[PDB]
Amino acid sequence: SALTIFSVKDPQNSLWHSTNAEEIQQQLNAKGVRFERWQADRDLGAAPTAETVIAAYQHAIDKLVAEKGYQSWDVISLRADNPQKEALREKFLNEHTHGEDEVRFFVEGAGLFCLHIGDEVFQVLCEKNDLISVPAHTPHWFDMGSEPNFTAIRIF
Ligand SMILES: [Fe+2]
Prior knowledge:
Elements: E1 2-7, E2 16-18, H1 21-29, E3 34-36, H2 50-56, H3 58-64, E4 73-75, H4 84-92, E5 103-108, E6 110-116, E7 120-127, E8 131-133, E9 140-143, E10 151-155
Antiparallel strand pairs: 1-2, 1-7, 3-8, 4-10, 5-8, 5-10, 6-7, 6-9
Fe (ii) ion is lined by residues 96, 98, 102, 140.
């Protein structure tokens, strides 16, 4: 719901910062990044799992991006009753990239998605409200800082 882009020399001095539908889309698409707003009106119950959240927003993946054979979709949820929430930070906080642009849609929970393109650091908040998809060759990392639960959908 927000986009920030400053020079690599000004990391704390967020120079350009704005949060608008056309504004976030113009900045994202202007860099070859797709962006859309999805409606999370599908209820999977109180706790959202990967298999269910998968079958429900499954029909939404068909309109997301039609290309290649799309191997499959997966979900990344963190539970507080699983000691793997602490080690999972170094596990998702490292740089991981693929040679194909993947898309991620959050249906339950919010995560801070940071993008790195050239000498600029992008800071955009992600919520189960809309959707975000970055290009291949572009590294992305999730912001943990804590052990909160968040449901995400990966398609590539
Ligand atoms: Fe990825």
